[PDB]
């Protein structure tokens, strides 16, 4: 704890303005990034399943520049596939939810940044308290585990040269496809 | 550090998007490529006009003389260029670190 | 994921996101009363 507690103070000294708004090495950011990582692994699993079961129509078909304009073009005179464009559109939905939630939050919900004179939540430590149910503890447990999972899965793909979907699919035992 | 990052970028872009390997086979005829163009304001006619340098994507031709220099001094492959780029990334970081250190 | 995708991902970020975040940060910095 002494190593971590000191590291937080160092970051707070370097970036007081950011740390005061819950940005950077904070419990605020830990939790929020945990939530996204948890949703993220579901989205990856759903992508692997949707691709396998043929939910996305004309997946490998390339988009037309006449219809969709210049943004379909990629680096080396390659065009974006329907599959990739579709997955992007799925993310645009929840990005716009995010922007709404951030700027215009519900009265009851957790807010993105800390209030003018709000302190941070106390760090959980090496192991948080094990409290079963819809608790801040259980959220932080699953959030930390998810973010570890994303780190591992990404790291595995580059090191081994396999696709993230292949790694995830083999990790689940060839269930998705 | 900025000088070394700039040199790194020149090496990297030529390694990745250039035609150095083709150029050395006919240096007085082939035009050397600086880097690729990606600009969504381009119409189709401009994409075609900038895609006349052997390769299948729009590019800028280099007038910096880097290809001529690199060929003279013994570079022959994109892997030579790439490792050069990697090396100069590390040197940039080293100078950056020395900058920080000498204010401690 | 391939490398030919990179310009289409990166150029919008370096051109339409990075500058506007930088401009916003600089604006906040220069207006702070402290």
């Amino acid at each position: 704890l002494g190593i971590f507690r000191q590291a937080m103070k160092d970051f707070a000294s370097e970036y007081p303005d950011f740390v005061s708004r819950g940005l950077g090495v904070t419990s605020k950011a830990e939790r929020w990034n945990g939530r996204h990582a948890m949703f993220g692994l579901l989205a990856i699993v759903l992508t692997g399943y949707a691709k396998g079961h043929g939910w996305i129509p004309n997946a490998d078909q390339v988009l037309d520049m006449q219809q969709w304009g210049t943004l379909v073009m990629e680096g080396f005179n390659q065009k974006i596939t329907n599959e990739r464009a579709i997955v992007l559109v799925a993310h645009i939905h929840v990005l716009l939810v995010s922007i709404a939630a951030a700027i215009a939050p519900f009265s009851f919900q957790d807010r993105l940044l800390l209030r003018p004179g709000e302190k941070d939540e106390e760090p959980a430590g090496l192991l948080p308290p094990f409290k079963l149910g819809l608790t801040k503890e259980a959220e932080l447990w699953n959030g930390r585990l998810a973010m570890l999972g994303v780190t591992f899965i990404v790291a595995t793909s580059i090191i081994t040269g396999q696709s993230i979907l292949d790694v995830v699919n083999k990790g689940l035992g060839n269930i998705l496809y | 550090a900025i000088i070394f990052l700039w040199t790194s970028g020149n090496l990297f872009h030529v390694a990745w998007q250039g035609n150095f390997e083709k150029w050395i086979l006919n240096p007085t005829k082939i035009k050397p490529i600086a880097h690729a163009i990606w600009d969504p304001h381009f119409g189709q006619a401009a994409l075609k006009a900038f895609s006349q340098t052997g390769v299948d994507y729009p590019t800028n031709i280099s007038y910096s003389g880097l290809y001529h220099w690199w060929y003279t001094i013994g570079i022959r492959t994109n892997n030579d260029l790439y490792l050069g780029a990697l090396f100069l990334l590390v040197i940039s970081g080293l100078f950056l670190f020395a900058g920080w250190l000498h204010l401690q | 994921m391939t490398a030919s995708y990179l310009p289409s991902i990166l150029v919008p970020i370096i051109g339409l996101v990075f500058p506007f975040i930088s401009m916003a940060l600089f604006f906040i910095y220069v207006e702070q009363e402290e």
Partner: peptide
């Protein structure tokens, strides 16, 4: 010639000057 793997190694390595630049910038 140059692989996706090689381009990702470059991008990862470019984080080192990025972070160090941040540190130098702050210290100045």
């Amino acid at each position: 010639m140059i692989n996706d793997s090689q381009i990702f190694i470059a991008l990862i390595l470019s984080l080192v000057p990025a972070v160090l630049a941040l540190k130098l910038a702050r210290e100045l």
